[PDB]
Amino acid sequence: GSSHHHHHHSSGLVPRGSHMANSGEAPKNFGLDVKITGESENDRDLGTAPGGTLNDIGIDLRPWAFGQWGDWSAYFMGQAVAATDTIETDTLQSDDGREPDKSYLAAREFWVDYAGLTAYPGEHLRFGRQRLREDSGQWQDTNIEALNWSFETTLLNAHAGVAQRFSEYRTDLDELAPEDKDRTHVFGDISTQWAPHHRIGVRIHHADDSGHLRRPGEEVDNLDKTYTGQLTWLGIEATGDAYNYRSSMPLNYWASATWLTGDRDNLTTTTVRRIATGKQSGDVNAFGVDLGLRWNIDEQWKAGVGYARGSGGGKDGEEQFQQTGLESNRSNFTGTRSRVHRFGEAFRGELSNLQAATLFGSWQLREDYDASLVYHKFWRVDDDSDIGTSGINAALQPGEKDIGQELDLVVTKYFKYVDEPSALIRFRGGLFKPGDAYGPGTDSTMHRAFVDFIWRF
């Protein structure tokens, strides 16, 4: 169930001989996830800089161990990567001493779990570096050091947790991303199934920076904070099988509305090299919405439409929405077993001063195949402000809303007619056509494409 150490993994695979594959089998005490990935990426900077391209292959080995003693359990997953260049073998990885190596080791998850606070097996308390995820992937979908309480039953779901990054636990990164340094997260949610397959809930997330900004006159570099914040997100979300590839309803939907409030102290800088010149404080009062509708046309075919908007601009930036920093924006919103980046495998938009229209169609055959075709159109909301994170590394021209368009294709075979697959092979690709906001001299297209072979043993 929810408690299982691989429950949140997008792969959805089940090792042969595991208790999930056959309930007569004992829970596995160990296993191995093998991933072989090729990545083609050109051009992340749209041709406005040297390099920024990938055509490379890697292997990622993830051994894991699991022990259970009554109400106590413990879990470790490690990671060993070897690649021909620094490709993305891990969809949950984000961002001098932050250059990844072509090969590295990592401690991916390490936690202890206690399920005895209540008699519900859906209720448990987990402590350590662990997978945090909610179904939208837009609040949390990451491996992070946390103390997280989960309560998942038929009629009531609730979670409450605290998290903070202290290390990457990687042989090649020595330092945290500035955004993560000294940032503490506190969060909770409560939701109820008010009708079969219809959920309504509220969600809260609070991020608190205890860091300091560089002082005036000090040089600022890659690894320094751009800002410190006290930010609270308060959201309501309604879903009808929003992310359930096995829905029997003719229509699935999601609707979320999120208010961001709090305050930011922003570092100001000038060039001389970058030098700090001061800081400016201000309140944040921003808003995000994500809406979608999926038609379940028959047993195999689905289609849908999406609309998202993160506010931008406003009186000294108060209306600039942003996400928690723990999000993936990866979800099953196209109604298949395969998770898809909600704002493009190529653009990888953060919902920050961003408006997106989305169309998709998908096809699924039992547990054996799925395919998604996704079209996105992106606009800035305030054309004098930047957007948030994105997989495109090029500057936006002031006064231009048209960010661009994207076409994504995901195609997956699961295997090892198959009841519960234990392996998959997947093509994951996005084609991004930059709009006028990227100005002249840009590449007319860029792409990011992956082939992933995943095996769970």
Ligand X SMILES: CCCCCCCCOCCOCCOCCOCCO
Of positions 282, 313, 429, 439, contacts ligand X by CB under 6 A? 429
| Gyration radius (Cα) of the chain, Å | 22
236 binds, among ligand X, ligand LH9, Na ion, none (CB under 5 to 8 A by kind): none
Evaluate whether 382 touches 399 at the Cβ level (below 8 Å). Answer: no
The yes or no reply on residue 189 touching ligand LH9 (CB under 6 A) is yes
Partner whose binding site includes residue 409, from ligand LH9, Na ion, ligand X, none (CB under 5 to 8 Å by kind):
ligand X
Which amino acid is residue 304, in one-letter code?
Answer: G
Q: Give the contact letters, 311-350, x = binds to ligand LH9 (CB under 6 A), - = no.
A: ----------------------------------------
| Closer of 207 and 449 to ligand LH9 (Cβ) | 449
Burial class (CB in 10 A: 0-12, 13-18, 19+), 335: buried
Residue 46 near ligand X by CB under 6 A: no
Beta bridge partners of 64: 31, 77
Task: Identify what 115 binds: ligand LH9, ligand X, Na ion, none; CB under 5 to 8 Å per kind.
Answer: Na ion
Chosen from ligand X, Na ion, ligand LH9, none, partner binding at 42 (C-beta under 5 to 8 Å by type): ligand X
- Out of 449, 450, 452, 455, the only residue in the binding site for ligand X (CB under 6 A) is 449
**CA dist 211 → 63, 283, 394 (Å):** 35, 18, 28
Cβ 42 to ligand X shortest distance, Å: 4
- Tokens found for residue 368: 């054996």
CA distances from 243 to 10, 31, 90 (A): 12, 27, 21
Closer of 279 and 369 to ligand LH9 (Cβ): 369
Q: Which of 177, 200, 223, 291 binds ligand LH9 (CB under 6 A)?
A: 291
- Terminal-to-terminal C-alpha distance of the chain: 19
Tell me: does residue 379 bind ligand LH9 (CB under 6 A).
no
Question: 161: which residues sit within 8 A by CB, 6+ positions away?
Answer: 132, 146, 147, 148, 149, 185, 186, 187, 188
Size of the site for ligand X (CB under 6 A): 9
Q: Are 192 and 200 in contact (CB under 8 A)?
A: yes
Strand partners, 449: 40, 429
| Residue 245 DSSP SS3 | coil
Stretch that binds ligand LH9, among 52-60, 220-228, 319-327, 334-342 (CB under 6 A): 52-60
Q: 295 contacts which partner out of ligand LH9, ligand X, Na ion, none, CB within 5 to 8 A by kind?
A: ligand LH9
Contact set for ligand LH9, span 72-131 (CB under 6 A): 74-76, 78-80, 82-85, 102-103, 105-107, 110-112, 127-129
